[PDB]
Structure formats: C-alpha cells, structure tokens
Amino acid sequence: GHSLQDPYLNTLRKERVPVSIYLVNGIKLQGQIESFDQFVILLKNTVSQMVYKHAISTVVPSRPVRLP
Amino acid sequence: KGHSLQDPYLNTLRKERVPVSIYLVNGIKLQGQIESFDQFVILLKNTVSQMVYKHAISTVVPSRPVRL
Amino acid sequence: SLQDPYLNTLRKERVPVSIYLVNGIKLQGQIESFDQFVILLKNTVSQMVYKHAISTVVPSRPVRLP
Amino acid sequence: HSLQDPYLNTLRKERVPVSIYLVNGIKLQGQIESFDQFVILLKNTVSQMVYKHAISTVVPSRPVRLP
Amino acid sequence: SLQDPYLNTLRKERVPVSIYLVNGIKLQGQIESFDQFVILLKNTVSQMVYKHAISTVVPSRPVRLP
Amino acid sequence: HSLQDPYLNTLRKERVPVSIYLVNGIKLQGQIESFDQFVILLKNTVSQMVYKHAISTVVPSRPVRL
Numbered sequence A: 001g002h003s004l005q006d007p008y009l010n011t012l013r014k015e016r017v018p019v020s021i022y023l024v025n026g027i028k029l030q031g032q033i034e035s036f037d038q039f040v041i042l043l044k045n046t047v048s049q050m051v052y053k054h055a056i057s058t059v060v061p062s063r064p065v066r067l068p
Numbered sequence B: 001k002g003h004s005l006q007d008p009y010l011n012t013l014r015k016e017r018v019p020v021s022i023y024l025v026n027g028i029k030l031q032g033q034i035e036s037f038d039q040f041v042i043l044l045k046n047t048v049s050q051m052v053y054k055h056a057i058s059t060v061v062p063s064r065p066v067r068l
Numbered sequence C, E: 001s002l003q004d005p006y007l008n009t010l011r012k013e014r015v016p017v018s019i020y021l022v023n024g025i026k027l028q029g030q031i032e033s034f035d036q037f038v039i040l041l042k043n044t045v046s047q048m049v050y051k052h053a054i055s056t057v058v059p060s061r062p063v064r065l066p
Numbered sequence D: 001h002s003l004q005d006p007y008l009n010t011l012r013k014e015r016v017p018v019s020i021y022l023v024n025g026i027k028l029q030g031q032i033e034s035f036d037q038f039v040i041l042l043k044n045t046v047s048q049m050v051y052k053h054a055i056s057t058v059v060p061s062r063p064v065r066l067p
Numbered sequence F: 001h002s003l004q005d006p007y008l009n010t011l012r013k014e015r016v017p018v019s020i021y022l023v024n025g026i027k028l029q030g031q032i033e034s035f036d037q038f039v040i041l042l043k044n045t046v047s048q049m050v051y052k053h054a055i056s057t058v059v060p061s062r063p064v065r066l
C-alpha cells in the first residue's frame, strides 16, 4: 500500500534530513520534510511550501537513510 | 486532491488571506489569494478570479510564513 | 461542489472564457456544456476539452461565485 | 460522462473527421472507429489506439448535433 | 472493453507495434503481455511500460478486431 | 496489477541492474531496492525514492525470468 512511502517520508521527517525534491518539470526543491498526507508534502525552507505528490518525480536525501 | 493536511493548510491560507504563489506543472506562476477550494479546484483571486485545477499545480508557496 | 456551479454560471450566463491547457495552449470561447471529465467549448471552432489537460479557467469578467 | 460518451458516439456513427490534439502538442487525424472508458480507436491514414489521458482536445471537422 | 482485446489481439498475433510515449519517445517491439497498468514490450530485453506514460499504440499492420 | 509486482520483485530479488526512464525523459540507473503500490526505492551511489507516476519505462540490463 503505502508500506514503503510512509516510513520513508516519516523517517526523513523525524530525523530532519535535508532533502532535494525533483519535480517532473525538472525543478529542484530543497529543504526538509515538515509533514505529509496521502496527496501532499509540506517542504520547509524560507517558508513551508505545499508540494503536490503528483508533481514529484524523485525524492533524494542528502545522506543515506535507514528505513525502520 | 483533498486530505489530512492539504485542507487545513489551504483553509489557513484562505482565512488569513495570505497572498500565495501557485506554480503550475509547466512552470507558469500564478499569484493571488485563495478565495475557496474543493477536492479538485482552487479559486484564485486578483482582477477576476480564476479556477485552477489541482492536478495542474506543482506547488503552493505562501508569501509569508504561516501556522498549520 | 465548487467546480460544478462555477462552470454552470459561466455556461448559463454565456460568459466568454480563456481555458489554459497544461502545455501552455490558450483556448477561447464560451462553455456550451460539461460533465465530470470534459468541457465543450464553442465559438471560433467548437471542441471537446479534457479537464485533465486544463490548468486554469479564466473568465473575461467577474462572476457570482457561491 | 453524460456529455463525453454521446459526443464520441455521434462522431463515431456519423464518421465525422476529427483532429485529436495530444497533451504534447501533436495532432492526430482521422475518424473514430470505436472507444471505451479509457481509449479511442482512430482509423484511416494511420490506424491507432489513443489513450484518453494523453488527449487535450477533440476538434471535429464539423459541429455535432447531440441526441 | 476495447483496450484489452486490441492489446490481446496484438499480443497473440505477434504484431510489431510502435508505442509513442507522451514525451514523444517512440518504443518498438512486440507485446509479450499486459495488465491493468503496464505493458511488457519485447525486444532485446523485455521492458516494462507504464500505460500512464503512453500516448498512442500503432501496429505495423492492420488489426482485425474479433 | 497482477504483472507489475512479480516483475519488480524479480528485479529486486536478483538485484538486476536496471535503467528507469522518467516521463520527462530523464534516465536513472541502479537497482530496485524495494517498492510498494506507488513508489520505487532505487539504489545507487545515492539512493532515492521514485514515484511510479513519474516513470515511463523500466528496462533491465539483461534478460530476466517472466
């Protein structure tokens, strides 16, 4: 179901891992994951922007991450 | 489309009438205040309003920080 | 909920609109009719427009909104 | 679907030449042979199955009268 | 309802097909199998193609629908 | 859905080198670490999470069981 996505985003959230989010148009967003629901992710930097998952290509952490 | 934190976040932006930038999947940038929204669309006000499809939005960026 | 009556007002009141497509294309006309997935837009040429291909709908004048 | 289906159906029955514009800007042409909930079968000069999700607009060569 | 038999007929008759992606890339091969969301397109190796990425499917020779 | 899963699982368990082509034309290379209904974790020098909706095609570097 969400058995990979949730713990992945959640781990990045709890550990405040700096991430780069890449959009399908090729824009690179940067910050940390503040929050997420089944459709969006709140990306924190200057302010917290809301990113639609449907617009995301990849999420790439700035360092390796242990899934729980 | 409509879920656990997208709604409260968008509702907050509506209620506090915070100017936002809305970036579309094709890179175009819209600006305005969120008048209202449902599961699929968002009404964005300036001269006349405009109905923006959620499916075409990549990110919503508030002009100043905001509390969730 | 919000989409349907908003389109309906534009339809019922014959309001000229610009429909911008996700690829940048700007279509113009008046909304003849619509359903859950498409919008039929007339004048110049008539055409059936998929909603999934639309980014925004911009009326040529302010609209009653509720 | 109360608009889409009879619209395509009429185009289908009356063999109306149509131009189908893809979301990527490409124009397909021909007549509709059949369709279902997700695809459209387009015939003649080039015969081919089109996914609805890649379609932006269907522009018939002449307006259609709905039943 | 029409997608299935069209793809099955192309499959069973080993018709070589051209699959155009929404980004404009053209893939070529034979349909090995398929399900609700993807198509397995056979050639050098078999690649998995997401339907959501496909714009058109064009057979190299005419298909007789059953 | 009955076909995407076993295919990905095979690539995963045999740790087969793969290229993943995104809907925007970008090519990613690596190996499938894991996956669920919506995302694929792609391993390499830097691991990353890839939404299926952004993928056009998965292409293994060698032929695989089907």
Ligand SMILES: O=c1ccn([C@@H]2O[C@H](COP(=O)(O)OP(=O)(O)OP(=O)(O)O)[C@@H](O)[C@H]2O)c(=O)[nH]1
Residues within 6 Å of the ligand: A006, A007, A010, A013, A014, A034, A035, A036, A037
């Ligand atoms: O922003 C969020 C945060 C959390 N969740 C979801 O909430 C559920 C619980 O998320 P938690 O992170 O609260 O679980 P936890 O008990 O491990 O956290 P701590 O109390 O130890 O800090 C998880 O299933 C996660 O997917 C979200 O969906 N979005």
Ligand SMILES: O=c1ccn([C@@H]2O[C@H](COP(=O)(O)OP(=O)(O)OP(=O)(O)O)[C@@H](O)[C@H]2O)c(=O)[nH]1
Residues within 6 Å of the ligand: B007, B008, B011, B014, B035, B036, B037, B038
């Ligand atoms: O345009 C809108 C407005 C509101 N809503 C949704 O309607 C629900 C009620 O939204 P409200 O914001 O009106 O309820 P509230 O009680 O929080 O407001 P106040 O009395 O404090 O003024 C909320 O869940 C909101 O997300 C929309 O979905 N779209």
Ligand SMILES: O=c1ccn([C@@H]2O[C@H](COP(=O)(O)OP(=O)(O)OP(=O)(O)O)[C@@H](O)[C@H]2O)c(=O)[nH]1
Residues within 6 Å of the ligand: C004, C005, C008, C011, C012, C032, C033, C034, C035, C036
């Ligand atoms: O092309 C259309 C027209 C109308 N409708 C939908 O069909 C329903 C009936 O559409 P009507 O246009 O008959 O409703 P009405 O005039 O009675 O509405 P009010 O003046 O009372 O506001 C409305 O809910 C509309 O959203 C469509 O779905 N497509």
Ligand SMILES: O=c1ccn([C@@H]2O[C@H](COP(=O)(O)OP(=O)(O)OP(=O)(O)O)[C@@H](O)[C@H]2O)c(=O)[nH]1
Residues within 6 Å of the ligand: D005, D006, D009, D012, D033, D034, D035, D036, D037, D067
């Ligand atoms: O390729 C097709 C053809 C037809 N149909 C759908 O099959 C149904 C039967 O379509 P028909 O064309 O066989 O019946 P009809 O139009 O004479 O009947 P009415 O629509 O006047 O009631 C119609 O609802 C049509 O939309 C498809 O879904 N795909």
Ligand SMILES: O=c1ccn([C@@H]2O[C@H](COP(=O)(O)OP(=O)(O)OP(=O)(O)O)[C@@H](O)[C@H]2O)c(=O)[nH]1
Residues within 6 Å of the ligand: E004, E005, E008, E011, E012, E032, E033, E034, E035, E066
């Ligand atoms: O790779 C495949 C092959 C087949 N199928 C689907 O499984 C069902 C059985 O497909 P078959 O092709 O095994 O049935 P059959 O030999 O009796 O040929 P038809 O009567 O279907 O013409 C058909 O509905 C087909 O669409 C797939 O979904 N994927």
Ligand SMILES: O=c1ccn([C@@H]2O[C@H](COP(=O)(O)OP(=O)(O)OP(=O)(O)O)[C@@H](O)[C@H]2O)c(=O)[nH]1
Residues within 6 Å of the ligand: F005, F006, F009, F012, F033, F034, F035, F036
């Ligand atoms: O990253 C993964 C790995 C595995 N899976 C899926 O979860 C299940 C894990 O199953 P496994 O691949 O670990 O074992 P198996 O099914 O071959 O062995 P049995 O348990 O059937 O005896 C399989 O159904 C696989 O498709 C994922 O969804 N994501």
